[PDB]
Design a protein around this ligand. Structure first.
Ligand SMILES: Nc1ncnc2c1ncn2[C@H]1CC[C@@H](COP(=O)(O)OP(=O)(O)OP(=O)(O)O)O1
Ligand SMILES: [Ca+2]
Ligand SMILES: [Ca+2]
Length: 348
DNA sequence: GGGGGAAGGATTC
DNA sequence: TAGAATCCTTCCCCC
């Protein structure tokens, strides 16, 4: 198998640059303004000019401005980025029918039927980069290898505006030398659980007792890492199906008052129904974010689709259930719909 | 901030 | 070698 992974560079900020070329060269910071107070909210993403100085996805807007007070701060326009994204994804389908859209700015292509070696792979990766730049004026990074995991790793090492092949030999090298923290699916919590077991590299997973590894990180991640370390990871390129659609809104103040919470919960419903488009959910979950930023969830599955009116009445009953079973104050409130009428995937 | 999947407990066959 | 499928909420990751 030969996988070609495409990752659009600093995507949201780059789209803003395309729509407003005067922004080119300047630090651009795309933000999610929460509405609590002035510049409350977080950075969604920043271009490389901003990131260079430490302004990155996840930091408070307040903190970003301390670092770069003169950067351009823009509100996230997801609808806009989604349309640009859709156009680029359509362009990629012209290079392979075996395509996996992993997110708004990431897609895997199985080009095993298209190319014979990694030299032609690299060439095809150049063609794709060139095509996206000419049609949309978007630069991307291409990662190429024998599977999805290493194709992603290649892109991670080569971004931005890059292209990298990790051949069979380099795959073996990385198994020995790559910090296991840099493997997709291993976040800070898993990395620390692993380090306490003495696993720092993929190769280390093969010598540790399996039940020790499993007990610590779960059977799934254990098997996953071992399959990688054995150079036997194979996961096919498959069409991802949206399984849930929702919205969580931040309230003006923390609250356990049903009447004060209701309007926010109802706005989340309205937005969520808009997003659903033609999808009809059979399941609804109310999701509360507590004052200490914990997450509490209660849901219901119906043997039928949920009308907006049923969503309204059920959501209150579910929020009442949360209020009863958790004494903490609620900071954010929202709703998530799933179990869509009519096929495989499409719900949870 | 949205959203997917696995962990782990409970249920039921 | 081994309860195991399934449903539910929490946990963890990532984009
Ligand atoms: N707190 C948050 N709020 C909203 N969206 C967030 C977020 N944290 C992350 N995201 C989302 C929004 C953007 C994305 C950030 O992840 P990458 O850095 O992988 O994507 P890109 O921006 O293209 O940078 P490049 O790929 O060139 O490194 O995740
Ligand atoms: Ca990207
Ligand atoms: Ca990591």
């Amino acid at each position: 198998m030969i996988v070609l992974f495409v990752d659009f560079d600093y995507f949201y900020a780059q789209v803003e640059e395309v729509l407003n070329p005067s922004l080119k060269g300047k630090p651009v910071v795309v933000c999610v303004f929460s509405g609590r107070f002035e510049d409350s909210g977080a950075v969604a993403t920043a271009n490389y000019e901003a990131r260079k100085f430490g302004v990155k996805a996840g930091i408070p807007i307040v903190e970003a401005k301390k670092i770069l007070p003169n950067a351009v701060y823009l509100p996230m326009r997801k609808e806009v980025y989604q349309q640009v994204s859709s156009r680029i994804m359509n362009l990629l389908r012209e290079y392979s029918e075996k395509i996996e859209i992993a997110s708004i700015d990431e897609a895997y292509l199985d080009i095993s039927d298209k190319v014979r070696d990694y030299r032609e792979a690299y060439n095809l990766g150049l063609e794709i980069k060139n095509k996206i730049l000419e049609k949309e004026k978007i630069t991307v990074t291409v990662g190429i290898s024998k599977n999805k995991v290493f194709a992603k790793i290649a892109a991670d090492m080569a971004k931005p505006n890059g292209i990298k092949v990790i051949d069979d030999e380099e795959v073996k090298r990385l198994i020995r030398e790559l910090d296991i923290a840099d493997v997709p699916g291993i976040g800070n919590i898993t990395a620390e659980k692993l380090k306490k077991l003495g696993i720092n590299k993929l190769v280390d997973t093969l010598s540790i007792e399996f039940d020790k590894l499993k007990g610590m990180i779960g059977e799934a991640k254990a098997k996953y890492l071992i399959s990688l370390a054995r150079d036997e990871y194979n996961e096919p390129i498959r069409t991802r199906v949206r399984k849930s659609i929702g919205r969580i809104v931040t309230m003006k103040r923390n609250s356990r008052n049903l009447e004060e919470i209701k309007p926010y919960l109802f706005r989340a419903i309205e937005e969520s129904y808009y997003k659903l488009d033609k999808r009809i959910p059979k399941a609804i979950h109310v999701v509360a974010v507590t004052e200490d930023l914990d997450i509490v969830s209660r849901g219901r599955t119906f043997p039928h689709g949920i009308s907006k009116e049923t969503a309204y009445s059920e959501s209150v009953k579910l929020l009442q259930k949360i209020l009863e079973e958790d004494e903490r104050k609620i900071r954010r409130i929202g709703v998530r719909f799933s179990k869509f009428i009519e096929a495989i995937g499409l719900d949870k």
